[PDB]
Design an enzyme around this catalytic site. Structure first.
Site, mmCIF file in Angstrom:
data_model
loop_
_atom_site.group_PDB
_atom_site.id
_atom_site.type_symbol
_atom_site.label_atom_id
_atom_site.label_comp_id
_atom_site.label_asym_id
_atom_site.label_seq_id
_atom_site.Cartn_x
_atom_site.Cartn_y
_atom_site.Cartn_z
ATOM 1 C CG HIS A 175 -4.968 1.126 6.537
ATOM 2 N ND1 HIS A 175 -5.636 1.954 6.266
ATOM 3 C CD2 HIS A 175 -4.113 1.219 5.234
ATOM 4 C CE1 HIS A 175 -5.524 2.295 5.647
ATOM 5 N NE2 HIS A 175 -4.974 2.070 4.376
ATOM 6 C CG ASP B 112 -4.214 1.106 -4.519
ATOM 7 O OD1 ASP B 112 -3.235 0.978 -3.438
ATOM 8 O OD2 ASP B 112 -5.180 2.165 -4.124
ATOM 9 C CG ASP C 128 -1.992 0.788 1.347
ATOM 10 O OD1 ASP C 128 -2.641 1.767 0.438
ATOM 11 O OD2 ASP C 128 -2.904 0.981 2.650
ATOM 12 C CD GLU D 151 -5.100 6.070 -1.717
ATOM 13 O OE1 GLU D 151 -4.160 5.312 -0.586
ATOM 14 O OE2 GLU D 151 -6.369 5.839 -1.923
ATOM 15 C CD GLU D 152 -3.558 4.409 2.559
ATOM 16 O OE1 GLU D 152 -4.595 4.666 2.476
ATOM 17 O OE2 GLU D 152 -2.821 3.800 2.717
HETATM 18 O O1 LIG Z 1 -11.973 1.339 1.690
HETATM 19 S S1 LIG Z 1 -12.727 2.515 0.256
HETATM 20 O O2 LIG Z 1 -13.605 2.677 -0.023
HETATM 21 C C1 LIG Z 1 -11.489 4.281 1.774
HETATM 22 C C2 LIG Z 1 -13.327 4.379 2.694
HETATM 23 C C3 LIG Z 1 -14.363 4.530 2.543
HETATM 24 C C4 LIG Z 1 -15.458 4.659 2.649
HETATM 25 C C5 LIG Z 1 -15.546 4.907 4.251
HETATM 26 C C6 LIG Z 1 -14.484 4.763 4.730
HETATM 27 C C7 LIG Z 1 -13.124 4.233 4.020
HETATM 28 N N1 LIG Z 1 -10.812 2.693 0.127
HETATM 29 C C8 LIG Z 1 -9.839 2.638 0.115
HETATM 30 C C9 LIG Z 1 -8.797 2.633 1.389
HETATM 31 C C10 LIG Z 1 -7.319 2.252 1.459
HETATM 32 C C11 LIG Z 1 -6.621 2.372 0.922
HETATM 33 N N2 LIG Z 1 -5.523 2.582 0.590
HETATM 34 C C12 LIG Z 1 -5.351 2.681 -1.071
HETATM 35 N N3 LIG Z 1 -5.939 2.138 -1.661
HETATM 36 C C13 LIG Z 1 -7.164 2.418 -0.475
HETATM 37 C C14 LIG Z 1 -8.684 2.185 -0.708
HETATM 38 ZN ZN LIG Z 2 -3.819 2.400 2.877
#
Ligand SMILES: O=S(=O)(Cc1ccccc1)Nc1ccc2nc[nH]c2c1
Ligand SMILES: [Zn+2]
Ligand SMILES: O=S(=O)(Cc1ccccc1)Nc1ccc2nc[nH]c2c1
Ligand SMILES: O=S(=O)(Cc1ccccc1)Nc1ccc2nc[nH]c2c1
Ligand SMILES: O=S(=O)(Cc1ccccc1)Nc1ccc2nc[nH]c2c1
Ligand SMILES: O=S(=O)(Cc1ccccc1)Nc1ccc2nc[nH]c2c1
Ligand SMILES: [Zn+2]
Ligand SMILES: [Zn+2]
Ligand SMILES: [Zn+2]
Ligand SMILES: [Zn+2]
Ligand SMILES: [Zn+2]
Lengths: 323, 323, 323, 323, 323, 323
Positions: C292, C210, C127, C163-164
């Site tokens: 994470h 990703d 990541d 990105e984050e």
């Molecule tokens: O889960 S996600 O939809 C983020 C999210 C969406 C709605 C509510 C809370 C969090 N996408 C995401 C999260 C972490 C990443 N690290 C690399 N690409 C990632 C992609």
């Molecule tokens: Zn992430």
């Protein structure tokens, strides 16, 4: 839903006689304000600072120590800023919370954030610490008539936090306290148990003081829906002159002129205005010569002007409230 | 800390041994739930109706009578609908309001507005009267261990008003209660006195139950960020079968079947999820066969599945809370 | 009314035979990558940190040692965040900048900002340190074939900053560099001197890598308009498997099984999709088990799964360009 | 009393016996649709083109020659595009306009804007000339039963203009005719002289045919509030096969596999869906192989798949309307 | 601190004596300006046209011949219009680009798109060809003193494209160059390497000239935070006249009449105003009589009025910058 | 897109000689208007009331009885309000409906919704029954000239429904008819068959009459881009005084004085303004003394003041139209 939000469009004042005007002048003391109300506010009090807190407690204590049955709410919220998240607290002081209708007096109690330029400190003496103290000296001068409350109407005082921008004046960086307060009230039912009306509908008129304290201000007519009440301010000023009940005062440069401004100045009233609340905006045009300088201090205030305005104001609350 | 909104990401459960599981199977009775918790809520209760007030007073009273020190909040607001202005009231129940973090259980307690079609009265038995009664039961059956609280983490329950549309489902006609509380929580500092964090940050995870009480339900895995906590439910389900503490239950008609779908359904989780709250959404796909008919009633529930579900969920909360 | 932004819909690949499929498999070194491209990037590199500037220098230098005529650009900008304004830098790497059309490989190079949990430091190995390194290994392995470009078509790489989220995933706390870069390409004339077309219109396909590095990844099939390029991937996989050019690999557990998902996963692709750019999104579901957590490190990466995907992807690109 | 928009929640079909089914079956002609309804539509017809005016004229002329009392209307509006301002015309054809409720069938009748690639012309045979033909053959094939219409319900037909993007799919470059018409119906009183309901509430259900005519289509069941009507389609395909009334048709490649979805596909239903209209969306997943290629022409149609689907659908409609 | 953006609030001028005012007056020639700066601009130059590239080339050349160290940047972008996608190019000319703060002077160099009404051609002499030649004349006449620059403060010039509406003044059809450029500056760290301030914060005061050249113009005083700078203009205009340095100039018809105007006029400052930049807006009220007619040409200009304004303006710029 | 939308900016008037200027004075009857046009409209006519249907029918019947051939349209629509969904109906009267351009006269016909204070009924004599009757006297007093229309310019009248707020003024609760009708015109191609232009492009100048009937009105000048047409009012007014065709009229009590206001004042012109229609706004400042009280009745109107306005307004139209 019932129609009491109509009542404000019909309300009329209860005009005072010459003997009762004289009593009001005698009732009000500028030097008592100056010492006990105003001076403890001349301090660095931007949002989040140890001065914000000192200032909020001083304002609370000066009110609690009156006889009239004031109800106090602290309204504490989190908002985002150019420097990140920060917490703010509006102070709200109400007589008879339950009455549908309230006349509202407002100002802002934060001071604009600055570094210590030329080894000085900004403390906003017109902006807006005098306005606060006039509010505090009104509740005290009239604590007697205001107690004769235990047309279903009473009085309310709002002291906003976060009026000034932190970094650069934009819609998202200014008026933090008033934007939050106007929305909160729009969505709170009023009176308690109501089904179709709100606390905003309960605002009879909003009187906003900003930038008061300099000599020779001039205040214009901003809005045609509150024109008839600004006119009462004129006639009150003119009658207390002919009775020589004012000081260093002249009819050749009156504070309330007869020339509508046209546009509007951005300020705490704006979130209220755009939801249909009537507004009387007591901000002068032009802005004091000291606006936003290290020289907006106690030294440049003008004791006599403030003392005149305290008087006219105190009468307007008294006639609006038929007291 | 600055800081602490980080912790929910690393939380790990305190898994329970075989002796204890048995203990809790025995500790809840579905027949008590039915008579004292569910049947009083099988009534017409759309927003503003007499039964809304009565649904509320019951839910309050069932809680007011336990041991653990539950704090009750009533959140009453005014919104606009296709029929004009209306008042709603959310119910929130909290153990240790001061803890930074709370695990959160929730459902909606309004029923959907219909005329009396065919001389029948819609009462939403799966949608969502059961859900309220499962939350009511749960707090009763674990009042014992939950009182032990007198890893800074406690427990909250939310009962929304106004989840259903009044006329036609849209963003302005739906989720009146959840859309209010999310905004209020995201703008309230937590824990009291904080400067850069909010009540929303304090929501460790949201378990929303909806449309529950029918036989052979199947719940998919909705989001990749709460995925691991759903794997727990699978393994709590698979360890009460082999122990023989479930009824009329097979491992080919399992409730939590690691599947995807993989898209999204609109519900009270939406305004929390789009501000970053982790969601465990306990709604089946397909909807119950009786969804939104006059036959979504007591007769069509299945006593067995609701007792099983209670068992799994009471487990999850004790393992989540390390009790 | 021009014209060429439609060429991308008729485009067809130029498939390789067995002997070219074997040469491609032998020209790529999973060992050379791991030490020269990946390991330098396994550090703390959140936006604004010393590590961010170090990752930018490593990526630029590795690219400069190649013979092909890569043109490099730093897109540095300012944005508001939960903690205040902050600076960000995307990295853009383009061959033949003047061509009308470009196939685009992309990933994010920041790491998520965490405190030092148990005196450990998050480094985001899947990541997305690995996809960065796969991108550098593709440019090395194919350097001989790509310096032949000197259809008006070529190749671009993009490494996004920000990105984050910094604090809690919202529309305003996420996808900082991709929201920025998309707005800028939409408002830039392409090719030079053009009157009615933009750089965004020149993106043939966005292949976003990703969350890669764990074993047994299942990549869904997200969008109807890009389905046939996903179908290329399946067949490429299958015919390398069936010449023994893969390792620790079985057809019963493929990476690209067909399985429509249907909804979206939030990511750097969202601001380009919303404007009509077709997207090939290589993010597995479910997420890697270490997602994470502090065990997203080098020791839980899979050498051979990674080596396999480097091969598939290099074949895909060479067919896409007729090389 | 109004109120009446709930009656679509309770509506049920009148299922037809085995003898009425052979009746319908022998009642349609797949070569007479092909000859008189579909072939004149296989032409260039992007919006504002001469093919657009020619296509509009053949549709209306063919409807006007039936006995049923079909009311024709032409919804002409202006709108901004990537190439500037442009004019469009939807075609609406309605039986019993005064009736509060209508079952709605629809497609789009424009063809996408392209240049003459390789000296060929794009006609969108599946996309969507065939759905247009199916709507016309249905209205002829059932002409004498619909003539009986003189439950307050009847039938409407809709052909949209400007469905496809001109240049790059986005919220402003797509769905021009549907976004216009949805907002018009939501702001028209219905029935005539009504005070609080609208034409949008009288849409019982929206049945949108798109990308049909290729062999072996698989149709998902996208929405929970129309799943009971997906069911009916599933069951109509089964009975017709067991009486041997279908051709070249296998219960192993049946059109309505119940597997679901997933998320969403943008189409003309989105402006109506987002406002509470129920939708049965007959787009297949995946899309034909010829999708958006010069090979989406007469030759690649499959005569037998269309004929079978004509029959299914006329049986769906007769049962919806109790005839 | 990171606090420098507050500096412009405290800036004060360095006021010139009467013999330096006489040098300025003698230092500017209206006929050199008329012949070598103004006349080549009095052509047709709407966006995209050949006259637009010609005016760009003339502006750049005339600056490139001066001894001062001007850095020239050409900012070129795409945007949507009533006629479709079009390309635009602003012109920015900067001394000391690395200095944190810049006093900004500006006008729009496009000319409004019209057909040739009565075989005549629209060239907008006041709108705004004259304001461009005033800006070029000031760089030339102050050239030797501007060379001193090599208080971290310098001078910048901006020529906007795309100010006029192509078809009908709307938020999307007007201010194409200034809305692009204010958004760009707001997201550009300044000075270089900065972490929390932008180029937009660097703008000390925005002095915007528009609709100048007709006789007897009256400029109002639009803004409370730039009002102390309007007063400098009046003082400059009074001194030069009593020293006998004006021409055909009456103190009963002075250009700067301390009359205020509350209604904003839309113009290129609006995107800056709404992000907090202070504006000295030099447009007269009422507009010139020739406004948007074929008679806004060279013969209706007044020579003496423009020469007086050149002198007032170069005194401003020297007193602002302390030269 | 053609050029004709330019024509409005060049258009010029065809002024009348002393003698045609008496023919006008003498061809209008204040006493016929008062009885035949005004008094029928002095009733309760808020939106949806029986008084609103009757005021539609008066208005139409008066226009239908005249030789000129006016085309009437009734524009009905549904909107959401603070009391629920409601039906509204604009009245639109056009000469030469197919001409490219039209000068536009307008007012509102609805009466504010109020409870019966002190057993009295609000009828809004100036707000706006008199503007309606003025528009009725003009078409009659000029019926004979306007029949010479059978310069592609003619006249339009517009009487809006739903101008006042039902409960509290806000952008969602006010201007229901104008907001609705500006959007419909912007999306209607004009003239018929047009591909690039709209009905809204055809509106030459919008003259909005409001709050007229009181003594001694002062009308300001609101907008720099319509100033030249206000100067015509001011000049028409002064020559009618000199010729002695004015009653009870001085020159120090000028209706149209030299007065520049800020601007807005919300009203029916707002939604046209935001799209570039030029506006002549005939509303006074201050508002009449009786505004939104029960004394806005027949007794407090002034016959002379309204008679003099009828004379000016009628000249202006024939001069604008070259009749
Ligand atoms: O889960 S996600 O939809 C983020 C999210 C969406 C709605 C509510 C809370 C969090 N996408 C995401 C999260 C972490 C990443 N690290 C690399 N690409 C990632 C992609
Ligand atoms: Zn992430
Ligand atoms: O000047 S304002 O119009 C805010 C503004 C808006 C746009 C551009 C620049 C500045 N109003 C204002 C500013 C400071 C004050 N301090 C006390 N009351 C104040 C009122
Ligand atoms: O693929 S779509 O979701 C639109 C889209 C969304 C995002 C990006 C790019 C394109 N739906 C679609 C596209 C073309 C069609 N032609 C007939 N029906 C069609 C349906
Ligand atoms: O006062 S207004 O600016 C609307 C307003 C704005 C904000 C707060 C309260 C009211 N416009 C207005 C009000 C009443 C009228 N009656 C006839 N035309 C009218 C126009
Ligand atoms: O008149 S404006 O306020 C714009 C406007 C607003 C509303 C409706 C129509 C037009 N500003 C304007 C117009 C033309 C100009 N030419 C040079 N500067 C100009 C400024
Ligand atoms: Zn201030
Ligand atoms: Zn429901
Ligand atoms: Zn298509
Ligand atoms: Zn102009
Ligand atoms: Zn009114």
């Amino acid at each position: 839903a019932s129609a009491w939000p109509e009542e404000k469009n019909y309300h009329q004042p209860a005009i005072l006689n010459s003997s009762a005007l004289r009593q009001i002048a005698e009732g009000t003391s500028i030097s008592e304000m100056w010492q006990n109300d105003l001076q403890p506010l001349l301090i660095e009090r931007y949002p989040g600072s140890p001065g914000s807190y000192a200032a909020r407690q001083h304002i609370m204590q000066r009110i609690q120590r009156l006889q009239a049955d004031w109800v106090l709410e602290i309204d504490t919220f989190l908002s985002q800023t150019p420097y990140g998240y920060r917490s703010f607290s509006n102070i709200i002081s109400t007589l008879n919370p339950t009455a549908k209708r309230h006349l509202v007096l407002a100002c802002h109690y934060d001071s604009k954030y600055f570094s210590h330029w030329n080894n000085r400190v900004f403390v906003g003496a017109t902006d807006s610490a005098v306005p606060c103290a006039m509010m505090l000296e009104l509740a005290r001068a009239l604590d007697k008539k205001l107690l004769s409350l235990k047309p279903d109407l009473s009085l309310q005082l709002i002291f906003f936090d976060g009026e000034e921008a932190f970094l650069h004046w934009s819609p998202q960086d200014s008026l933090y306290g008033s934007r939050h307060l106007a929305a909160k009230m729009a969505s709170t039912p009023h009176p308690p148990g109501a089904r179709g009306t709100s606390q905003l509908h309960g605002m009879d008129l909003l009187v906003l003081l900003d930038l008061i304290g300099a000599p020779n201000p001039t205040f214009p007519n901003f809005f045609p829906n509150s024109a008839r009440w600004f006119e009462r301010l004129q006639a009150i000023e003119h009658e207390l002159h002919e009775l020589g009940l004012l000081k260093d005062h002249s009819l050749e440069g009156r504070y309330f002129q007869n020339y509508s401004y046209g546009g509007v100045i951005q300020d705490d009233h704006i979130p209220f205005l755009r939801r249909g609340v009537p507004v009387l905006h007591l901000i002068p045009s032009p802005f004091p010569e000291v606006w936003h300088t290290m020289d907006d201090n106690e030294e440049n205030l003008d004791e006599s002007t403030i003392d005149n305005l305290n008087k006219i104001l105190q009468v307007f609350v008294l006639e609006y409230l038929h007291l």
